[PDB]
Amino acid sequence: VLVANRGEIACRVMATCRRLGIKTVAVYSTADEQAKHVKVADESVCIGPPASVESYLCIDKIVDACKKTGAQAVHPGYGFLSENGEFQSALQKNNIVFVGPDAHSIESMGDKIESKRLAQRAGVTCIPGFIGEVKTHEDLLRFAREIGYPVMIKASGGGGGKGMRVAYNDTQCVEYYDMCREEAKAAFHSDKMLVERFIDHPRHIEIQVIADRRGNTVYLPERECSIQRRNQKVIEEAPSVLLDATTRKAMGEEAVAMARAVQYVSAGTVENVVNPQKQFYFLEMNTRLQVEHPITEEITGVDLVEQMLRAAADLPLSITQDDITINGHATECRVYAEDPMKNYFPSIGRLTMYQEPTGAGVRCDSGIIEGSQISVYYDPLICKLSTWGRDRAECIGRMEKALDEYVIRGLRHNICLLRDVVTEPRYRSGSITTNYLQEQYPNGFKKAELTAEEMQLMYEVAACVHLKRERLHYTQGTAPSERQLYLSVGAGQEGETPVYVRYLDDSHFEIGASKHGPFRKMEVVWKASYPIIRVKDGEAETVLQFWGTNEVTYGMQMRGTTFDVNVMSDLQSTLAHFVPITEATTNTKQILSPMPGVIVAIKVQPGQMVVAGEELLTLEAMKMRNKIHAQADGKVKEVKVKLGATVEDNEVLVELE
């Protein structure tokens, strides 16, 4: 079989075949000649230029290419043009298997409209509210009391969240209807309002579904997709805390009942919104192969890929709802190349200087091997880290530990945000909401700080590392074994903390306050000039990272955050006070081209916003295109140098004001 995706899922598929003993083929674009899925595959064929359209999206190339492998079936994947009719039609022109759902169900359910029809076909507890215009305030109050809901005032013709106000009491209902009619009459030319059961605070619970072309339909355990930034989810978890069998059993039964309704074959997944009063709302249903199943597979072992490919041959499944159980729970997170602390700045075109994944009792699905890069015209996802567990505390701690052991170098990421979110006591309380993120991050993003004991431990580990790397340079036995260091982070030596060290063995020290002070005998295990640093005092265990140094300042990472600790002796400490600290030039002015050349491409527009790290234009000289970018600034005021202006000579190409 041949896949249709070029991400982690492709690798997953070419991995499921291992046990299924199925030879696999994987196509690629020109830029992806070095992707892992190309080498993992048994066969590879090029699909032209790497721009999205020609790459994979070029059905004609793809379907035509499906004539040499011999494979009797070809996976549709989950992204790009997966589950598409124009594609399903073409594949049934050449009479080949789709390894996916049937057309009628797909167009009946994935369609934007008429989904409410199928929803109300059997009702299935669809959105509740007075179905019609509320012409009077009396009707609005009466229908609000009917269910005593937060009103969910929404315009009949309005969409996207415009014309919506949340009413909690009758006076609020009247005032918000008065505002809503005024807003909607001006904005959408419709005064027709509707009132529905608004949700106190949503959790966005999701229910998984599987089926088959013969029978033995099964309901998979539900999942969580509460956390969501810009309508994109981050953290997922299958057995949500607010789970009662009274609801859940009916959820599975109703999902299976809806399944046969449209004769769905390859079930996508069911979407719900759940309030603390344990309701459910079947709508916004999915018909795509969601790849958040690893979590479910961790709590079940139900290999969705194997079962769906088995059903693609008109055979029933190998599992029934009778044996499906729960053996704990799993947590999954997504690693993006999106720089959060810097206003969510995108960082692309950077191959991995060097990276190593966490592999301690955890699972990681990724398509980015060492020496791989991310283009602008693709998904900036790095890895899909998922860890098995049985308890919240157990599963989370694992994630905590596994986050710190993920070495990524060569480009930014959002691991700090994931770490801070997981460590927050609100997240460990047990329950969350969908507005959780912006509720806990009002102004931008700011990572939480360190407690006193954590900073002390970081100091101790830094001193141990300094001594260990110092002993390497000495010759033969003429080496020291004890010092007294003065650690102080910050440019002003904030909190000078005297530290000792003794190095009793290769990976054991006798850290103390100073000489003639009680000693603790911690342990540090670190390979010289490497990232990972495992330190264990008593039971507590920590993992820190070592970035680099200039022999007075150490670049060490603590809880997924970079710091610069200063490790200096008595003389250096007493002398660093008497050192000039000059301030570098802070110039917000025009930028000039360093060398002569020709401008062939421009990226930014005249007199608009500019952010740090953004490419601006590209000169070509002596057969070579450079690319001077914007180091750091907010905006510009200038006149653009036109295309093909072979002038340069250190002119003012862009002027920053």
Place this chain on the structure above:
Amino acid sequence: PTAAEDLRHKKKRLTAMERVQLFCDPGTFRERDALVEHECHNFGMEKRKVPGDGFITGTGKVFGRPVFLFSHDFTVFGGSLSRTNAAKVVRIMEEAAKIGVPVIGFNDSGGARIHEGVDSLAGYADIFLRNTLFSGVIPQISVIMGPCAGGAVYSPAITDFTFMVETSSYMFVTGPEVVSAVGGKLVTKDELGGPHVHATKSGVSAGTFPNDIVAMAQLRRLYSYLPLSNRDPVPVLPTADERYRDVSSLNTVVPTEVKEAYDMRDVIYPVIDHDSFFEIQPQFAKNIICGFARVEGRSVCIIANQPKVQAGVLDIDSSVKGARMVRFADAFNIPIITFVDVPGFLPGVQQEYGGIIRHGAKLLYAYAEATVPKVTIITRKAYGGAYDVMSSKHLRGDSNYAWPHAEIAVMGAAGACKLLYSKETAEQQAQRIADYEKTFCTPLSAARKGFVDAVIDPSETRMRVCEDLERLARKQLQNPWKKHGNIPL
């Protein structure tokens, strides 16, 4: 007790003794001479004698290995040299010539001492002669912590490496007063000879540091690389890194387009051991990189082009930089590893008006004269005389390697097509340039001739380099008998 140094520190500056204490080991400095006077007897100098006479000379010890050093003192007479100051320095250099030990000096002198007359010139001449004679015998490093003017500037110049401190140091031959007197332009001391000027414009300073503390901390690290003398072998340090570490990221560094640029450090860093690069002259002639690095625990010399800056084109400044680095590396038996990516020489009238012919020959002379083991890797391209200059196999090179997408040709395809068909029918571009580039802009022809040993996968570079550098440990080559060469100055 912190007497007499409060006046110094109040100006945000350190003292000579404090610098010496910071450089060496905690308790291994033994000051040599401390009670010496100037015995001048002129211009009312018979009084105000000083015990130290403005110099601190000792022995010290760094990383368990011996050293010699001296430091000027700015408080006493402004650091001026004399018939008596220079005697201590001469004695130290002579002793460090008998024993195979290097010398490091921290310059702070304000100029010559006028009250001694021509005795200051005598001392300067003796120091110059010692530097000239002992260059190439023991490594010499110089750091400039404060003002350095007059004719005293020449002795740091002859030394192998000169470093500078950022805020409070400068160096030049003639002061701005004379410049105003003759030309009439008002230029400040920093605008004339500041650390930035010598870092970027003149190319004299080999580096710049932000503070004295950082200067000492990194000077120790630099010292950890050098061999002790001319006859001593290259130092080898223990290291947990191993030649079997996987480097497969090199397969993707070179883009598939011939007009796109990349950073050569992405090729340099994987091959060498982790966090073991010490760049030399980082802000001058950025199209070429030179420095020191370790390969399997032994120090080597790195010289590579960079297509990031000016398409990696050789030039005057790059030629001088590479020539000096190669000469120093060969003088002390240090292996050389080079990475080649050059389209040719920089074209321009200013270049010929500035003597490209002289300067470009220096790098070729340095590469041909060298007798240390050499390893060369051609990543993408090498054209014209630039291929010859950058350690080609014909210049007694030990082992040469190429990557599968390399190109070695006489010149670009356009010029060859033009010269090979004078008045051939128009549109000849499309069906001739492509064919010529396909047939002869590839390493197959150069491999057929025997100019590259083998064509290797980019993932095997570390393995090959470690193997070759281990095997070549005991090469013995000698040049014909000469009093000395005649390099194109």
